[PDB]
């Protein structure tokens, strides 16, 4: 029976909430008051990058913490040298409506995707001097929102067709698909061990998938609006989500309940990008008020503003060594902060 | 200079990439972008045929003006999560099927979409080149059935001249930003050949007004 099964699902959800409540003996805010405050964080723009002529929508750091890839709506994908503001490559995309970009851990491949429903992987290193497209991935019936690299041969993708895809680059096929989301998936984050990965959709919920099985282990429903950004903790057992209700939340993977809420009354605009620094103490979140905040992951007190952008901070990322934070904005200006 | 030979050569390569970027950006700025948000089956493909994956790019020129039309109606997803990508488009070409006033009602769906995209926070200053497609079908249909099925407050005459004007006024009553944007309306059909010209004058008027606002004259 349809309604009997719906009632069983409702009872199951109540039981899950009861288990979470029983686990909720204390809270992070009540357990991290005796620790010393992080102190005021003052970061300055070391490198500001010129060369994009339209709204920058995505960025991703390289593993070596020196190279990065910037995606903008002008149709070009500039690979940046952060230490000295040079352009190593400029990639003319087939479609100018790019919305995500990922730098492979090896560095030989960069991937972009957007409203064209295609994840284009570009071979940076080849015996031609070109950055010719290695493979174009098709199969998504919606806009592509996030791209992340497992290795040189596998890339995971989040799209707006209420699904996520794990591709095989060499064959351009759909190895495993992740179904279960009700709204459009906006961003995914990969665990450091790449065994699992999370995904924040528009149904005010973030899930946790087993990449090698395609199954959804865990569901985290904490927000009230769309989830735009997501980022795993450096430890690998937590992940923060940037929602549209101007609140960030730190979930955990072992008690399946929200641990901490990053909210302030003076902020009423949603979060475009969230990424922890090294050691996971600082939560750098970019907002729609031309601003980027720095939060303490263990104390509600804000660390410090990171203003300096003339438009919305579309995306931001922290280096692998944590030395610098690069933030992309809709004003055609990359800025790197230390 | 504290720079190596390879560092200097890489700087030169970066400058060359910058020059290519500037050239491509100037070429793109010489062009015009036209977002095409039709109300589904409301004669969207007819106008595309008259001017000559997920998002379809249509490129055409007229009096040495490189236009770019973006048919995004095939996305079939949430419009709020990518409609900001087109923010800054020169003009939205809205297609409404006049004969769709008998199909709730299809014309009411078109009106709802027009209200949603005209009053969006991104297209406040982005004008709308509205198209009222299938005027021949409207002229044929208005005699068999009246407009009272679609518009209950309508009380005017029955001829096409007044009914089409009433529909245009109803569509043009939806813009709350009557000052910062202007709705260009045209009654097209399958046999018209001047639609691309009308698009040209509407776009050039939009660009002229944008330049005048940017130059301080307004």
């Amino acid at each position: 029976e349809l309604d009997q099964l719906r009632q069983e699902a409702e009872q199951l959800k109540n039981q899950i909430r009861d288990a979470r409540k029983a686990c909720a003996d204390a809270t992070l805010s009540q357990i991290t008051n005796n620790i010393d405050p992080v102190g005021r964080i003052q970061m300055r723009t070391r490198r500001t990058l010129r060369g994009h002529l339209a709204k920058i929508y995505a960025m991703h750091w390289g593993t070596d913490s020196r190279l990065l890839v910037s995606a903008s709506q002008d149709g070009k994908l500039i690979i940046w040298d952060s230490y000295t503001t040079n352009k190593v490559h400029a990639i003319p995309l087939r479609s100018s409506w790019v919305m995500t970009c990922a730098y492979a851990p090896s560095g030989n491949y960069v991937a972009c995707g957007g409203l064209d429903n295609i994840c284009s992987i570009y071979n940076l290193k080849t015996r031609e001097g070109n950055v010719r497209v290695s493979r174009e991935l098709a199969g998504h019936t919606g806009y592509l929102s996030c791209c992340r690299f497992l290795d040189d041969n596998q890339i995971v993708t989040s799209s707006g067709d209420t699904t996520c895809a794990l591709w095989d680059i060499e064959t351009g096929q759909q190895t495993t698909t992740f179904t279960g989301h009700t709204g459009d998936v906006m961003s995914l984050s990969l665990a450091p061990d790449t065994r699992l990965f999370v995904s924040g959709a528009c149904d005010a919920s973030a899930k946790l998938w087993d990449v090698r099985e395609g199954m959804c282990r865990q569901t985290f429903t904490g927000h009230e609006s769309d989830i735009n950004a997501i980022c795993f903790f450096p430890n690998g057992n937590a992940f923060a989500t940037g929602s549209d209700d101007a609140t960030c939340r730190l979930f955990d993977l072992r008690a399946d309940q929200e641990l901490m809420t990053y909210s302030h009354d003076n902020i009423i605009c949603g979060i475009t990008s969230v990424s922890f620094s090294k050691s996971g103490r600082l939560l750098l979140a970019g907002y729609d008020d031309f601003n980027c905040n720095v939060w303490d992951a263990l104390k509600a007190d804000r660390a410090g503003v990171l203003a300096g952008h003339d438009n919305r901070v579309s995306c931001l990322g922290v280096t692998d060594d944590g030395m610098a934070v690069a933030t992309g904005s809709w004003d055609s200006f990359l800025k790197i902060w230390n | 200079c504290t720079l190596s030979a390879e560092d200097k050569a890489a700087v030169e390569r970066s400058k060359m990439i910058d020059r290519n970027l500037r050239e491509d950006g100037e070429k793109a700025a010489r062009e015009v972008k036209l977002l095409l948000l039709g109300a589904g089956e409301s004669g969207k493909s007819t106008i595309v045929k008259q001017m000559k994956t997920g998002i379809v790019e249509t490129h055409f020129t007229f009096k040495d003006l490189h236009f770019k039309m973006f048919d995004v109606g095939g996305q079939r997803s949430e419009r709020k999560k990518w409609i900001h990508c087109f923010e800054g488009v020169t003009a939205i070409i809205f297609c409404v099927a006049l004969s769709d006033y008998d199909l709730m009602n299809r014309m009411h769906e078109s009106m709802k979409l027009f209200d949603s995209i005209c009053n969006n926070k991104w297209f406040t200053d982005t004008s709308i080149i509205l198209f009222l497609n299938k005027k021949d079908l409207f002229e044929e249909k208005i005699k068999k059935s009246p407009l009272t099925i679609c518009y209950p407050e309508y009380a005017g005459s029955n001829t096409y001249e007044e009914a089409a004007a009433y529909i245009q006024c109803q569509f043009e009553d939806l813009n709350k930003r009557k000052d910062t944007k202007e709705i260009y309306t045209h009654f097209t059909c399958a046999t018209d050949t001047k639609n691309v010209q009308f698009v040209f004058d509407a776009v050039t008027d939009v660009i002229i007004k944008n330049n005048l606002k940017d130059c301080g004259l307004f």
Partner: single-chain antibody
Amino acid sequence: VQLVESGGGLVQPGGSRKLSCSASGFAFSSFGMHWVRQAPEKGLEWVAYISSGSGTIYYADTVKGRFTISRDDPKNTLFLQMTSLRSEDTAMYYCVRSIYYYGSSPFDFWGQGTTLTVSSSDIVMTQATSSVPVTPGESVSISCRSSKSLLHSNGNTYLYWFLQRPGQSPQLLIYRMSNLASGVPDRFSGSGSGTAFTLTISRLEAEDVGVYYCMQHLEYPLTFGAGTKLEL
């Protein structure tokens, strides 16, 4: 990817010549081309360098003002106009493919070369080992010493190793301090102290026989080293 070259001949001294290097198989415009000589019994010597877009053109002190290098990007060819050909310009001119960005591999591919036989303050690198023998399957460490330290302020040591098999064009092995080039077996390894450098190879076969040239790219002119031959 290939760089075939035309030119050469029996030029009476003082005449003129125009060597050409037609490139096919890669983005020629994005690569800064080079020219390298080789006397019949001597080592390599740099000639000229034209960058991407011909922005900067460099010449060696032995050919400056006398030689003229230029490229035709649409035609995918490289020109080296020569005048007043001395009898000391008799060499095997090589067309060298080089690109310049972070993590790039300059001097990737070398051309076949032309046999031009005219009738009749830089960092000097010394290779002490003129010629050493080897037992096939052992390990050798070719060591060459520079004049001034090649370790720049950016942490990059600009030392390049080139292998020239008998009767063949030079091939890049290690394009910096411990940076193996593409298509090179992992047995080739190199490491230096900033002024004195070595190139160590673990196991040797008939592929390794040849002459190894160590070159510096810190500043122009691009001084090479003498020949270091490995004999079975």
